[PDB]
């Protein structure tokens, strides 16, 4: 809601900063396999548990 708590605003903040794509300079590395970010999340489909 809009009446969050601190532990929850902070957990949503972490879940916001984990939600960005891999930097493009990172699959020009040598020992590399990650084609893209597969742990991504959309607010509509997957509902963050909670």
């Amino acid at each position: 809601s809009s009446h969050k708590t601190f532990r929850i605003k902070r957990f949503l903040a972490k879940k916001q900063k984990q939600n960005r794509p891999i930097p493009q300079w990172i699959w020009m590395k040598t020992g590399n396999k990650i084609r893209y970010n597969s742990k991504r999340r959309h607010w509509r489909r997957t509902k963050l548990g909670l």
């Binding site: 794509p21 493009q24 893209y36 991504r40 489909r45 997957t46």
Partner: peptide
């Protein structure tokens, strides 16, 4: 400098629904 594509996940649907509405009573 080769740019990249994208990817989005989605829950896997499981087929288990059974209405079983049809009834054929014949004693």
């Amino acid at each position: 400098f080769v740019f990249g594509p994208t990817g989005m996940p989605g829950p896997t649907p499981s087929g288990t629904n059974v209405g079983s509405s049809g009834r054929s009573p014949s004693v």
